[PDB]
């Protein structure tokens, strides 16, 4: 009975931290092996009176108590564990008080209402009266959780305790109390929130510190989601209006970030009458981070309105703000704006997308910054779905040559991936005239991903344009660059063999495809033999039995005892897969 306490006290004092962790992570084993009333009687006062100097053990014991409250004997006997769990609140670390408050959240969740009405209310009212701020943070959390199981008089007592604690001067308990206001009204009725919660909410939003106003405005968006359409205009709406244009930029940054749930909560008439002019005030100010957030939110603000008025407000107010935001001297604002600009295209009608968004599209194409270019070129697929390929192709005619040679390979990657649609729409004659050279230079780039994308692009072209065109215009250049001393150029030619052989045909597979593969399997570079083994492995099934048995089998038995072990293994598994022997 006392020997567990003795080994606990001689084990908690050492050098390392792993041993106490292994002890208290298995303290539930000690409790279940020893008994129930024993650990109610002596072990709980033992863990109260001891004070440790390390923080992670407090986390582990808190979560162990949270998992242990079931092993205590059920919800009826958990009154023994409440003085220790409230004794854990007098700590100085954030993670351990978070673990403590979530443990007490679980305790409040699992437990039958009558002895919450009897016992937890004095405990939360007494730790609410604690002088330390951590006790008040735990108090406002516990008052946020203890609503639905108490009676009306006990309710009104905890409401007036909440007004007693929420009015104090020190800021961190006001932050915690504002967060618990945001979590608090999610369960209340309409009359109590419309009578006393919202005027003191306005009072707490009327103070000076920025962060209490931050937590106040997301508490405002929660209560706007909660309150019906009939009452929010008269009381909390001027509060959020006067909080919209405050002196600090943090509050307008947050109400920009929270603007979408605000406009979803209030309803379209309030958005048109009040939120739109404040939003023109939002993107047209001097701070630039709020401007980037304003672009990030003008995307999902324009997608979420009513149609018959969204068209008018975008043709009347939004587009001049877009034109002003494009010419902004800050760069990150332009990058974010170009990230979220062509999402307006499926929203907006066709000819208006042309006559407004395409000049700014071509403007954002030629910007010297890379992030704006990579964002707009990634969004070119989304604008490509709603705008027909013909006028988009004619728009990208003088802009396709500068974007195939720019520094960043993301833009080149997306241009290569998008190019088959452009070539298929735009015809074969133009590609044979002055557009094949771009793909030819793409096949010999430095970046591997660019070359692999160009090889898949070759697959798309041989699929979309036909057989004899690829015979006349693609294969001889592939062989001429197969005759290149550099090794990775030979790698790209092997990739061309593989990927163009996916469609290809049957006649060219033995008279201009196979012999070049055969004749260069004796290159001293082991990677050449490695990938010619891979190419033979893949190209096996498309070939017929005569060529597969005439010269493929002797070259594969030639390459299966060479010095490098990797090419030997892939030659062996190529012979295994192709069933050559």
């Amino acid at each position: 009975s006392l020997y567990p306490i003795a080994v606990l006290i001689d084990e908690l004092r050492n050098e390392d931290v792993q041993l106490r962790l292994n002890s208290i992570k298995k303290l539930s084993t000690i409790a279940l092996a020893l008994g129930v009333e024993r650990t109610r009687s002596e072990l709980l006062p033992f863990l109260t009176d001891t004070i440790y100097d390390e923080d992670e053990v407090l986390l582990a014991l808190a979560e162990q108590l949270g998992t242990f409250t079931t092993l205590v004997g059920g919800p009826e006997y958990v009154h023994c564990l409440l003085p220790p769990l409230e004794s854990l609140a007098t700590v100085e670390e954030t993670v351990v008080r978070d673990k403590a408050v979530e443990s007490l959240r679980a305790i409040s969740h699992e437990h039958s209402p009558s002895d919450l009405e009897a016992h937890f209310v004095p405990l939360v009212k007494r730790l609410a009266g604690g002088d330390w701020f951590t006790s008040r943070t735990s108090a406002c959390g516990l008052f946020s959780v203890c609503y639905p199981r108490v009676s009306s008089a006990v309710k009104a007592e905890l409401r007036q305790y909440f007004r007693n604690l929420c009015s104090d001067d020190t800021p961190m308990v006001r932050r915690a109390a504002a967060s618990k206001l945001g979590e608090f009204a999610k369960v209340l009725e309409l009359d109590n929130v419309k009578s006393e919660i919202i005027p003191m909410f306005s009072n707490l939003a009327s103070d000076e510190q920025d962060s209490v106003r931050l937590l106040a405005v997301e508490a405002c968006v929660n209560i706007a989601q909660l309150l019906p359409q009939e009452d929010l205009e008269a009381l909390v709406m001027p509060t959020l209006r006067q909080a919209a244009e405050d002196k600090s930029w943090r509050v307008r940054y947050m109400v920009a970030d929270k603007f979408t749930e605000l406009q979803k909560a209030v309803g379209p008439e309030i958005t048109k009458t009040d939120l739109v002019p404040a939003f023109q005030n939002l993107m047209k100010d001097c701070e630039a981070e709020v401007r980037a957030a304003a672009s990030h939110k003008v995307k999902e603000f324009c997608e979420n309105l009513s149609a018959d008025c969204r068209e008018n407000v975008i043709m009347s107010q939004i587009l001049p703000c877009i034109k002003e935001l494009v010419s902004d001297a800050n760069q990150h604002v332009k990058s974010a704006l170009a990230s979220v600009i062509m999402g307006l295209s499926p929203i907006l009608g066709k000819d208006n997308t042309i006559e407004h968004l395409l000049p700014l599209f071509l403007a954002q194409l030629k910007d010297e910054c890379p992030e704006v270019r990579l964002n707009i070129i990634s969004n070119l697929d989304c604008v490509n779905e709603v705008i027909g390929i013909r006028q988009l192709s004619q728009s990208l005619l003088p802009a396709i040559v500068e974007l195939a040679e720019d520094a960043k390979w993301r833009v080149r990657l997306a241009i290569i991936e998008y190019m088959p649609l452009l070539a298929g729409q735009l015809g074969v004659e133009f590609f044979d005239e002055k557009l094949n050279s771009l793909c030819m230079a793409w096949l010999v780039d430095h970046v591997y991903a660019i070359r692999e994308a160009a090889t898949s692009n070759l697959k798309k072209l041989v699929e979309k344009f036909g057989k004899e065109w690829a015979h006349a215009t693609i294969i001889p250049k592939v062989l001429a660059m197969s005759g290149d001393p550099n090794y990775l150029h030979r790698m790209t030619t092997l990739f061309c063999i593989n990927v163009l052989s996916e469609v290809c045909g049957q006649d060219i597979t033995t008279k201009h495809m196979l012999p070049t593969v055969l004749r260069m399997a004796g290159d001293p570079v082991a990677n050449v033999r490695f990938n010619v083994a891979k190419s033979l492995q893949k190209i096996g099934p498309i070939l017929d039995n005569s060529t597969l048995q005439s010269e493929v089998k002797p070259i594969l038995e030639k390459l299966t005892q060479d010095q490098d072990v990797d090419v030997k293994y892939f030659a062996q598994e190529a012979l295994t897969v192709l069933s050559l022997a």
Binding site: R250, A288, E289, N330, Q331, H332, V333
Partner: peptide, 6 residues
């Protein structure tokens, strides 16, 4: 570097 992140 226009990212205060506060």
């Amino acid at each position: 570097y226009l990212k205060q992140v506060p």
